[PDB]
Design a protein around this ligand. Structure first.
Ligand SMILES: CC#C[C@@]1(c2cc(NC(=O)c3ccc(C#N)cn3)ccc2F)CCOC(N)=N1
Length: 375
């Protein structure tokens, strides 16, 4: 109910993600680690990459154990490769416990770390299924729950903007971080945090799409992604409707594609011309759904580094819907692993104005929600 030690344990810069402090090895080596619900490895920088403030030094730890196994993780942009081991892991502003966890010691990477950022590793909070190299590599949170009496649950309050903050409550919920009620959507399958979107509204106007399109080929909740990413077909329909609703002002085609910024004189941004975005999610009960609603304050991201400018952070995807920071910053989100469900509630810290607020509302009646999931 109240975990005062863990409130405000997240830091970050706008655009660079949310990180928590962790210690690895004996004696403890302090590192800043990206909180990532879209991956399942605990992967830390372990060599002196010039971009990194700090890195894991295995030679300094008496509790380090080599698994004698390498891992190689490519993607379209670049890669990371590491050496698998285990060591003792602790979270200073988390539960008072010490865990033997898997660590991928990153020894070479490309386009992985961010130049100028204050984190040097990633905490993959998703499930074993998508761990590299395979599901035999037990994820951190699985190790934490197996080795301690920490409840099988964590919650995230990501507070948007140059210095963002928030809370990762590990093993529970802090009721001060949200208003109103939590509403829960089932975790469809334990790999990513997969969920089912059953309906999409732009300013109350239904997009009227076959709800299967909203989840093609999956919908996930991902704190390790900035944007609200929408399947191509859905993105297309959504921007068409956002354009119509905001047609009072015109903007270049590049703005809606994230290829270009738009700027207003300081303090004059016309939030009111931009529509709210509502996602209905599958509820706990047969034929029952609920709705989450975000403002332009979530999807128009301030860009400080130019030479009041904003980027459109709803973008097209071929990996399905990703509910990134654009969604999560509106809400306190409860990753209730024990009950295979994810809870949403209005965040006590979300950015809004005097006219509109982020919202979690229900119940609604939605039929054939099971047909919305992709096979
Ligand atoms: C292993 C791993 C991983 C990644 C991954 C994520 C990131 N995140 C970020 O830089 C980031 C995160 C949040 C916000 C925000 N707000 C801004 N920036 C960087 C490198 C990665 F390889 C792969 C792509 O997707 C996810 N989920 N995890």
């Amino acid at each position: 109910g109240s975990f005062v030690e863990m409130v405000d344990n997240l830091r970050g810069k706008s655009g660079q993600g949310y990180y928590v402090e962790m210690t690895v090895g004996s004696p403890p080596q302090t590192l800043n680690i990206l909180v990532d619900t879209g991956s399942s490895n605990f992967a830390v920088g372990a060599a002196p990459h010039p971009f990194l403030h700090r890195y894991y030094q295995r030679q300094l730890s008496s509790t380090y154990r080599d698994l004698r196994k390498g891992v190689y993780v490519p993607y379209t942009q670049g890669k990371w490769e590491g050496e698998l081991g285990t060591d003792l892991v602790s979270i200073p502003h988390g539960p008072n416990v010490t865990v033997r966890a898997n660590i991928a010691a990153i020894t070479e990477s490309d386009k992985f770390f961010i130049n100028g950022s204050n984190w040097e590793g990633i905490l993959g909070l998703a499930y074993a299924e998508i761990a590299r190299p395979d599901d035999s590599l037990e994820p951190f949170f699985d190790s934490l729950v197996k080795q301690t009496h920490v409840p099988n649950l964590f919650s995230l309050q990501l507070c948007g903007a140059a210095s963002v903050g928030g809370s990762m409550i590990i093993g529970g919920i802090d009721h001060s971080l949200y208003t109103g009620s939590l509403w829960y959507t089932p975790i469809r399958r334990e790999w990513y945090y997969e969920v089912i979107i059953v309906r999409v509204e732009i300013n109350g106007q239904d997009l009227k799409m076959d709800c299967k399109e909203y989840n093609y080929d999956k919908s996930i909740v991902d704190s390790g992604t900035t944007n609200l990413r929408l399947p191509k077909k859905v993105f297309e329909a959504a921007v068409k409707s956002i354009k119509a609703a905001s047609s009072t002002e015109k903007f270049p085609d590049g703005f809606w594609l994230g290829e270009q910024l738009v700027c207003w004189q300081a303090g004059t941004t016309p939030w009111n011309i931009f529509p709210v975005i509502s996602l209905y999610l599958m509820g706990e009960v047969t034929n029952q759904s609920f709705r989450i609603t975000i403002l332009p304050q979530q999807y128009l991201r301030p860009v400080e580094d130019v030479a009041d400018c904003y980027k459109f952070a709803i973008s097209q995807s071929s990996t399905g819907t990703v509910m990134g920071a654009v969604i999560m910053e509106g809400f306190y989100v409860v990753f209730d692993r024990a009950r295979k469900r994810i809870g949403f509630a209005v965040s006590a810290c979300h950015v809004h104005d005097e006219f509109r607020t982020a919202a979690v509302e229900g119940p609604f009646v939605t039929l054939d929600m099971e047909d919305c999931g992709y096979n």
